[PDB]
Structure formats: structure tokens, C-alpha cells
Nucleic acid binder design. Structure first.
Ligand SMILES: Cc1cn([C@H]2C=C[C@@H](COP(=O)(O)OP(=O)(O)OP(=O)(O)O)O2)c(=O)[nH]c1=O
Ligand SMILES: [Mg+2]
Ligand SMILES: [Mg+2]
Lengths: 412, 555
DNA sequence: CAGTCCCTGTTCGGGCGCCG
DNA sequence: AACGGCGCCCGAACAGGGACTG
């Protein structure tokens, strides 16, 4: 009884044609059981090879969840419908969500299954379930309703979502609610008891209309930033000063006022690396001046909503992972560090996966975008294991880099 | 008026803005003429082919070969111009079934659907786009033109349609027989069950009659009821499997096309024959771009070929998959970037074997290549069995712990244990983390001219030691490596080296043990001889330390 | 600052094997 | 002399960043 909102690809672009990657036995069995129930409920339908489009599919389990969830990698289809969920039917991002004391994330993706999808667009939602050892050909489906993980789903459902949340927002005007992908971000300055109580009221508000029982809690007011810090030693050697000048010179690309004149004068000659060099009166002055500039904010650094977010991650060792978020080089909007995440001291890929998910969550809260990641890892290594540790219902863009640490810039 | 078959049709369109094929026929021999007029007459009475007239302004040639060592023939076509204008299909064939992934079944039957493509209908509105004439005489009768009512052989949409139509027909039978396994690859059907031999034949005939309702015939010509079964190019026995006999050519003079077929068969044989190498044979296929050019076998390529023939002498076999037992994968180093592995569940009962010999990157080490081999085995195992095997690796836990905790890129190996089988994988040198007290400090630098290709490389040290070496036909990157090489040559067992070359430092910090560069290999040889080496980087053109001093000498 | 170079990386298409 | 699938080893074309030169 609902008219399907017409959806069209961006002009000059064809649908996604991404090959399905191999799935483990438990993931295939989970997807077969899930797709059988969705097919019985009319959410999906089997298709043939005359549909040239295809999108990868796999399965995840959220944090502390034993229930399999179907996850479609709609990254290719999303950027091929970018003028729809950003230009035509966009969602405004509240600047106060990051200021709230507690923010709970609620999975509302199941609500999209009640709204039908445009018949002309259903062919672009095709996915293929593989078989173990290629016993059977690929089992292809396509969506009949708004699919989870497609950015057009919250955009079309926004009109329906607003009417559902309208009574709750009038009851609590101080609560900020933001919707991104399959998730709902609810922030308030209430106490931990009062917050979780209001979250349960919102759950009952959605019930009167399979992961709604979960609630991942955030605290953006407790999110810390990792500045560039300089070492403080009692004695300095030639090697210590060479590393210090190397770090300050790279830092000059961010802070133009950093000087290395009086420090480079200490290295006059061809001295042994371990020779102790006492800092002169001017060297203490220049080093103290550079420590204050690192406390001053960078000039002309602000968020541009028309530009993409970029995120770089560095493996610092011993469970330490630093990161920077920027739109223009050396204009970091945020810098941070993670430590002692799951997989620390045993699994780099799980830590990197955790770090990517944390950075993306922060970016959704602060700016409403997901950054494109520059991952310090080989492509084949990441593509072999990353799905084993993914616990999020969205997937950011990423690329792979290899930059040896010539100087420890973000973590001494 | 042709009867519509029970199989559902697949709506096939064409790319917008394009029409159908209009290609003239190809003059063939009279042997092909008397081998196709009888086919179009039999397919016309069976409804597989209808006759058209002047209202069909299309045409397509129809060259044809035979069948492999058999009596019959295979009518082929040239839809290369139709494929360019036909819509793209998404292939549902995602891989090739491997016998090592088959589980134990008491009873096994291999079927073969006769006339596979000729039993599946074509789209009604698409039959008009398949026109072709058949001249009864080579230059007399013009020949009445026909069309296709089924799937033609040679059309790019025929395989995808048959595989999808076959699945829809088997779906109701599989739902009524859940305990029966049906491996469906193209038209060949592998049917297995743990039922008794008598009850198994009963369900086979039930399946043969089920497929017969849609016009799919399973004749007794290629019906297999007893081992050994020839399935997917293998020999299936009740408790083991092996590859069909592989014949390697033995010519006195080897060309280029002969080696390409040789390495191809060795790659196909390396799935169950352990220890096959193709490094020195494939090395002969470099540079030469003439398939009909004789290539003499190198002494290394001859010994490699001799060792592969001796492996193929003793017959080998693989076992089947048992889900109740763990999956084990063991890797060995064969030297020169060559790795071989075996996947098994019980000791010396290999499911399959394999090799990894890819050389990626100009500079690498055994630890990186072992990591790449683990990833290749992991993905291959998920395809075949859907799980990652436990690894047995010839690298110490302490060695691996040092590499991954100190590397700047994220790297990881799944659950594994050490196996003591030389040659062990190790790191051949370790760069120090702090400068070495008492070791001479070498400030190195190198500069070269872009135009004349001339350059210099040298060093200055804290003890007054100094060298400048002129270089001819070089680059700035080569002189920076040469400067470090000079410092390693002219220093004691412990040395501190200060450079401004991000290029050189990035190569050496990744602890390579092999390189496509003779200079890097010489640097590696020196790094191994040392007891302690500390590399430090400083920015150039900043008047820093001795780096400013050595910069004046080389530039 | 552009425009090169040097170096190293990925992508792709074809050679071969194998299946149908 | 056809089509589709997978694997390997190959080379040419292309991308991208440090570093030097006008
Ligand atoms: C071997 C082969 C096969 N095919 C297609 C056609 C039918 C299926 C199976 O072919 P087939 O089993 O060997 O021949 P088929 O048409 O079934 O006739 P039969 O020999 O089985 O009676 O794959 C093809 O297009 N080209 C080929 O070279
Ligand atoms: Mg057949
Ligand atoms: Mg230099």
C-alpha cells in the first residue's frame, strides 16, 4: 500500500558488478538460513544469470552477540547512487550529538524491510550465496524491500522514521537523535540510569510500529586527542638531537613556526652518535618555544562538508595504534591513539579492524561521514582476515599503503 | 507451431542501440557439409530447430569440430559477433570442485545429461537473433535457413542459462532427498549417499525420472555405476582419489610452446605430487616472444625437469575429507623463493598438495614469503572445505614473534605450531634500536647527475675516516645505496650509519634477505657479517651532524 | 611551484593447464 | 576457428611518491 520511491543511478554509471568472495562454512550456513526466511517473507526473491549485477555478501556477529547477521557490501552501489542519499533526500547531521555525555547506538535496519523497493532498482541489489567446494552453482537473490546497508534505505525511510520519533522528541526535547545507515544514534546529558531508561522508552516506541534489544553505548565527551609531544630527557646525545630535529622538521609542515636553528647548531661537526651534548641557553629557549607551539591549535583547520574525510593509521607496536583524520594534508581535524584493544599482543589484523571501526564510529558522531582509510597493511593480508573480525553493519572505503617509519611522529 | 518445453525460459535481451548478427558464411570442406545437413534435419523434427524465411535479416557462420576420441560430432557456431551485442550475464559458476573436498560416501553415481544445451529452450523473443544458413552443396543449392529454439553451443549466454536451469530442476528433488549429495558441475551430476547399493540405485532412477519430466535425458552410455569414476578429470575410488595419468612430452629439441605446455601440466600435477618446481622452466619463457623458437634447456632447468619426472614415476593419491578431524597444512621451503605444502588430516594421508613460488616485490625475505604462502593456503582451504587449517610452519615462534611485533605493517598468521624441518625460516640480521656505544659513526651520502648519469658516493666518520668514490652510469638512489655499502665494507663488526636517503633506509629496515638488485644483495651480505648495525635517518639540506660534511664531498 | 626522473607498485590480458 | 569457469607465470601499461632541475 506504499508507493515505491523511484531510484536511479548517477548518470553515466552502470550497476555494481563485484564478485563474491569465498565464505566459511558457518557463514554460508548462516546466510542460507537467513535468506530462506527472508524469501518466505517476500523480502528477497531468487533471480537468474540475466541480471548482470552482483554485490558481495557475508555474515557478522556484533559485539557480545551470538546471533548471525547478514551483511551486504553495498559500498559500490552506494557511491553509484550518491546523488540520491546526499542531494535529493539527505539527513541533517546534529552538531550537538558529539557534545552529549552518552550516546547509544540502536540497530533499526529491520524497519526498512516494511517499505517496498522500486521495481526498476531491484536488479542492482543482486547478491550471490556461494557453496563449499563449488558443489552447487551460486544461489542468486535480489531484494524486494529496502535492503540493510544501502544508503538509500534510511533516506527513503526518513519520512517514516520522523513520524515514529515525533512523539518521543516532543516528550524529551533535550535528546538528540541521529540516523546513519541501519543505526540510530541517541544522545543525552542524563545520568547513566536516566539515559538507559529513556533508551528503553524509545525501544518500546519502535516496538509499537532482530537486534533492537542491543545497545552499544558511546561517550563522546570522554574522547581524547593525541597531540604531538616532544621527549624530555635529563641528558641529550647526538642521536637524540638528530631524531629531535628530524621530528621538528616534519612537524613544521603542520606548525609553520617551529624552528630548528639553535638545535642544529648543537650538531656542528662529525660527532659520534652516543656523544652527550649539553643543551645551550638558546637551545633550551628554542625547544621550550617549540613545545608551546605544539600546544597552540593549527591555523585555518575547519570541517568542509563537501570534502571527503581521510583517515591514516600507524602501527606503533605493543598494542599502540595512532590515527589522524583530515580532509587536506597537514590539516588534521582530529588525532588520536588506541591502546590495549581486542587482539593486543597477538593479532594485528583484529586490532586494525577494531581501530577502523572505532575511527568510523567517531566520524559518524562528529561529522556524519565515514572516512576513507589508508591501512598500514598488505592488500592480501587484509582481504584474508578482515571479515573474521568485523562487527559493524557498515563498511568504510579503504586503500593500502606501505610507509616505513623514518621518524616516530605521533608516538615517541 | 513448436511445443514449449517444461523448462522455464530465461529472458535474454541485447545491448541497447544494436541489432542482430549479419556475418557471411565461411567456406568449409565437404566433410563438414555432410555432417551438418543431417543434424539440422533431426533437430527440426525434434523441435530443437525451426526453419525461417526472408523475414529474418540475420546470418551467422557455423564452423564445427568433432568430439574428443568418440564417434559422434559436436556442432559448433561462431557467435563472436552476437556475443558482442548480447547482454552481459553474471556467471553462477564460481569455481571448480576439487576431489579433496568430497566426503566419504558409501554409494556414488556419476550421471551425464545427454544433449545438455539442446534440451534447454531459448528466449522466445530472442530466437529471431539466431539465424544461420545450411548449404547442402558447397556451390550449388543455396540451402534453406533455420533458427535455434534451444541453447546453441558457442553463445556466451548458453553456459550460464543451463547451469541456472539445471539448479531449478534439481531444487525440488534435493528438498525431497536431503541426505543425498548432488555435485552439479555443468551437465555432469555427482550423486552420493550413505545408502546401500540397492537403495542407492532406486534413488538414482527416481532422479533420472525426475529429470526426464523436463526433457533431460541421462543415457546409459556415460552412466557410471562402479569405481573407478572419471569425474572432473580424476579417478574416484571408494577410499581414495588420484589424478588421471599425466603424460609429459619428451622432445629432443624444446621450443617456447613446448615449455608452456610443460609448466602447465606440472602446475596441474602439483596438486597431489609433492615437490614439483617450475622456477627454472618458467624462467626460460622470459623475454623471448616467439612461440616457434627453439630454446636450449639450462643446466638448472634440466635438473629441475629431471626431478619432476622422478616424482611422477611413483603413483600418488589423495584421500577424502572427514569433517570430524582437524585440517592440517604443513609448508616446506624449497629455496630460491620456492615453497611446497601438504594439506592432510591424518599423517602421510594427504588431501592435496601445492606450491607457492610467486616473487612479489623487488626486495623481500623468507618471512614475508612464508606469510604470503599461508594466505594462499588459507583462501584455497576456505574454497574447498570452508575452514582454515592448522598450520605447521618451519619458523620458530620466537623468530615470528620478533618479525611481526617489530614490523610497521599489520601482519598475522592463524593458529600454527613450529615444526623442526630444515631449512628453517629466520631473519638473517637485526638492526639495532639504539646507537652503539664505541662503534664508529659513518655519515654517508651519494649524489648523481640526471643528465651525465655520473655520480659520487662516500662517507665521513667521527674518527676522521673518509672516502669518496666516483661512479659512472648511476642514479641518486644507487649512490645512496652505494654510500651505505661503502660504510659497511670499511667498518668493523659494529657500526652506526647516518643517512638522509628515505629510499635506502626503507629497503634495509624491512630486513630483506633477497633482492633483484645485485647492490642490495651485496648490502645484505655485509649486514649478515656484522654484529651490530644501527641505521639512523636525518633530513637532508639542514646542516645536521656530519651529514652536512659528507654532502659537500659527493655534490 | 611544474615537470621530469627513478623506483616500485597494481592491473590486465594472454600463454598454458584443467573442467564442461 | 566457439562459450564459460578456476589456477600459474608472463610482460606491457599505468599509477604514485621522493627528489632534483628550470
Ligand atoms: C566439452 C564441451 C561442452 N560444452 C557444453 C555443451 C554441453 C555441456 C556438456 O557437454 P558434453 O556433455 O560433453 O556433451 P553433450 O552435449 O552433453 O552430449 P553427450 O555427449 O553428453 O551426449 O557443456 C561446450 O560448450 N563445449 C565443450 O567443449
Ligand atoms: Mg552430457
Ligand atoms: Mg643524501
Amino acid at each position: 500500500p506504499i508507493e515505491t520511491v523511484p531510484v536511479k543511478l548517477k548518470p553515466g554509471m552502470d550497476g555494481p558488478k563485484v564478485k563474491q568472495w569465498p565464505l566459511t562454512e558457518e557463514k554460508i550456513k548462516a546466510l542460507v538460513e537467513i535468506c530462506t526466511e527472508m524469501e518466505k517473507e517476500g523480502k528477497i526473491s531468487k533471480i537468474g544469470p540475466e541480471n548482470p549485477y552482483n554485490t558481495p555478501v557475508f555474515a557478522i556477529k556484533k559485539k557480545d552477540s551470538t546471533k548471525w547477521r547478514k551483511l551486504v557490501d553495498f559500498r559500490e552501489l552506494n557511491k553509484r547512487t550518491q546523488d540520491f542519499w546526499e542531494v535529493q533526500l539527505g539527513i541533517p547531521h546534529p552538531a550537538g550529538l558529539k557534545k552529549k555525555k552518552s550516546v547509544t547506538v540502536l540497530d533499526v535496519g529491520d524497519a526498512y524491510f516494511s517499505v517496498p523497493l522500486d521495481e526498476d532498482f531491484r536488479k542492482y541489489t543482486a547478491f550471490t550465496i556461494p557453496s563449499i567446494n563449488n558443489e552447487t552453482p551460486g544461489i542468486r537473490y535480489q531484494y524486494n524491500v529496502l535492503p540493510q546497508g544501502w544508503k538509500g534505505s534510511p533516506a527513503i525511510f526518513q519520512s517514516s522514521m520522523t513520524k515514529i520519533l515525533e512523539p518521543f522528541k516532543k516528550q524529551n526535547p533535550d535528546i538528540v537523535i541521529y540516523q546513519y545507515m541501519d543505526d540510530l544514534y541517541v544522545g543525552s546529558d542524563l545520568e547513566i540510569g536516566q539515559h538507559r531508561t529513556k533508551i528503553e522508552e524509545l525501544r518500546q516506541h519502535l516496538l509499537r510500529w532482530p537486534f533492537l534489544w542491543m545497545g552499544y553505548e558511546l561517550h563522546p565527551d570522554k574522547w581524547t586527542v593525541q597531540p604531538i609531544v616532544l621527549p624530555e630527557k635529563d641528558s641529550w646525545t647526538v642521536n637524540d638531537i638528530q631524531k629531535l630535529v628530524g621530528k621538528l622538521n616534519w612537524a613544521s609542515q603542520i606548525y609553520p613556526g617551529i624552528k630548528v636553528r639553535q638545535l642544529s647548531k648543537l650538531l656542528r661537526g662529525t660527532k659520534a652518535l652516543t656523544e652527550v651534548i649539553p643543551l645551550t641557553e638558546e637551545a633550551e629557549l628554542e625547544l621550550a618555544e617549540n613545545r608551546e607551539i605544539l600546544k597552540e591549535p593549527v591555523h585555518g583547520v575547519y570541517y568542509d562538508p563537501s570534502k571527503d574525510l581521510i583517515a591514516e593509521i600507524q602501527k606503533q607496536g605493543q598494542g599502540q595504534w595512532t590515527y589522524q583524520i583530515y580532509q587536506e594534508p597537514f590539516k588534521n581535524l582530529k588525532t588520536g591513539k588506541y591502546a590495549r584493544m581486542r587482539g593486543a599482543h597477538t593479532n594485528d589484523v583484529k586490532q586494525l579492524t577494531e581501530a577502523v571501526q572505532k575511527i568510523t564510529t567517531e566520524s559518524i558522531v562528529i561529522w556524519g561521514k565515514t572516512p576513507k582509510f589508508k591501512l598500514p597493511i598488505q592488500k592480501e593480508t587484509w582481504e584474508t582476515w578482515w571479515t573474521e573480525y568485523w562487527q559493524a553493519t557498515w563498511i568504510p572505503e579503504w586503500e593500502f599503503v606501505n610507509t616505513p617509519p623514518l621518524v616516530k611522529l605521533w608516538y615517541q | 507451431m513448436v511445443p514449449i518445453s517444461p523448462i522455464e525460459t530465461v529472458p535474454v535481451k541485447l545491448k541497447p542501440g544494436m541489432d542482430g548478427p549479419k556475418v557471411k558464411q565461411w567456406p568449409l570442406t565437404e566433410e563438414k557439409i555432410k555432417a551438418l545437413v543431417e543434424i539440422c534435419t533431426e533437430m527440426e523434427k525434434e523441435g530443437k530447430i525451426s526453419k525461417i524465411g526472408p523475414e529474418n535479416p540475420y546470418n551467422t557462420p557455423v564452423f564445427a569440430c568433432k568430439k574428443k576420441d568418440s564417434t559422434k560430432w559436436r556442432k559448433l557456431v561462431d557467435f563472436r559477433e552476437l556475443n558482442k551485442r548480447t547482454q552481459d550475464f553474471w556467471e553462477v559458476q564460481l569455481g571448480i570442485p576439487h576431489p579433496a573436498g568430497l566426503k566419504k560416501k558409501k554409494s556414488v553415481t556419476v550421471l551425464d545429461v545427454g544433449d545438455a544445451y539442446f534440451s534447454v529452450p531459448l528466449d522466445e523473443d530472442f530466437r529471431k537473433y539466431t539465424a544461420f544458413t545450411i548449404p547442402s552443396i558447397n556451390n550449388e543449392t543455396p540451402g534453406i535457413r533455420y533458427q535455434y529454439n534451444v541453447l546453441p553451443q558457442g553463445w556466451k549466454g548458453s553456459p550460464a542459462i543451463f547451469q541456472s536451469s539445471m539448479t531449478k530442476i534439481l531444487e525440488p528433488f534435493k528438498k525431497q532427498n536431503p541426505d543425498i549429495v548432488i555435485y552439479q558441475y555443468m551437465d555432469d551430476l555427482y550423486v552420493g549417499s550413505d545408502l546401500e547399493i540397492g537403495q542407492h540405485r532406486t534413488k538414482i532412477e527416481e532422479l533420472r525420472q525426475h529429470l526426464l519430466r523436463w526433457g533431460l535425458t541421462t543415457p546409459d552410455k556415460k552412466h557410471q555405476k562402479e569405481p573407478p569414476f572419471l569425474w572432473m578429470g580424476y579417478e574416484l575410488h571408494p577410499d581414495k582419489w588420484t589424478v588421471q595419468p599425466i603424460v609429459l612430452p619428451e622432445k629432443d629439441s624444446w621450443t617456447v610452446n613446448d615449455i608452456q605446455k610443460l609448466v602447465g601440466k606440472l602446475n596441474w600435477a602439483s596438486q597431489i605430487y609433492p615437490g614439483i618446481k617450475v622456477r627454472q622452466l618458467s624462467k626460460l619463457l622470459r623475454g623471448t616472444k616467439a612461440l616457434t623458437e627453439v630454446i636450449p634447456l639450462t643446466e638448472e632447468a634440466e635438473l629441475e625437469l629431471a626431478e619432476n619426472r622422478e616424482i611422477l614415476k611413483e603413483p600418488v593419491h589423495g584421500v577424502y575429507y572427514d569433517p570430524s578431524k582437524d585440517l592440517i597444512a604443513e609448508i616446506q621451503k624449497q629455496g630460491q623463493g620456492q615453497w611446497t605444502y601438504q594439506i592432510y588430516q591424518e599423517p602421510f594421508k594427504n588431501l592435496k598438495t601445492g606450491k607457492y613460488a610467486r616473487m612479489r616485490g623487488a626486495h623481500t625475505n623468507d618471512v614475508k614469503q612464508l606469510t604470503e604462502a599461508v594466505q594462499k593456503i588459507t583462501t584455497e582451504s576456505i574454497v574447498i572445505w570452508g575452514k582454515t587449517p592448522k598450520f605447521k610452519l618451519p619458523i620458530q615462534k620466537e623468530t615470528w614473534e620478533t618479525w611481526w611485533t617489530e614490523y610497521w605493517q599489520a601482519t598475522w598468521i592463524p593458529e600454527w605450531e613450529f615444526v623442526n624441518t630444515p631449512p628453517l625460516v629466520k631473519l638473517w640480521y637485526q638492526l639495532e634500536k639504539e646507537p652503539i656505544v664505541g662503534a664508529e659513526t659513518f655519515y654517508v651520502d651519494g649524489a648523481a647527475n640526471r643528465e651525465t648519469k655520473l655520480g659520487k658516493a662516500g662517507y665521513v666518520t667521527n674518527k676522521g675516516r673518509q672516502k669518496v668514490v666516483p661512479l659512472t652510469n648511476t642514479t641518486n638512489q644507487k649512490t645512496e645505496l652505494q654510500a651505505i655499502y661503502l660504510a659497511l665494507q670499511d667498518s668493523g663488526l659494529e657500526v652506526n650509519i647516518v643517512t638522509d636517503s628515505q629510499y635506502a633506509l626503507g629497503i634495509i629496515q624491512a630486513q630483506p634477505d633477497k633482492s633483484e638488485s645485485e647492490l642490495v644483495n651485496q648490502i645484505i651480505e655485509q649486514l649478515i657479517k656484522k654484529e651490530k648495525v644501527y641505521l639512523a635517518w636525518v633530513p637532508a639540506h639542514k646542516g645536521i651532524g656530519g651529514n652536512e660534511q659528507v654532502d659537500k664531498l659527493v655534490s
